[PDB]
Amino acid sequence: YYCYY
Amino acid sequence: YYCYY
Ligand SMILES: *[C@@H]1O[C@H](CO)[C@H](O)[C@H](O)[C@H]1O
Ligand SMILES: *[C@@H]1O[C@H](CO)[C@H](O)[C@H](O)[C@H]1O
């Protein structure tokens, strides 16, 4: 999965 | 923050 910060 | 699964 991937996350934006 | 938000994550794509
Ligand atoms: C997340 O955003 C970037 C641009 O910041 C890019 O379009 C990636 O493909 C996306 O997953
Ligand atoms: C994550 O992706 C969705 C896809 O429908 C949408 O562009 C949201 O604005 C983005 O944050």
Q: What is the largest CA-CA distance in chain A?
A: 14
What tokens does A4 get? Answer: 């934006």
Elucidated via: X-ray
How far is ligand 2, taken at its centre, from the CA of residue A4, in Å?
11
Chain A residues with CB under 8 Å of B3 CB are: 1-4
What tokens does A3 get? Answer: 């996350």
Chain A residues with CB under 8 Å of B1 CB are: 3-5
Cα separation, B1 vs B5, in Å, equals: 13
* DSSP 8-state symbol, B3: E
Look-up: residue for tokens 């934006």?
A: A4
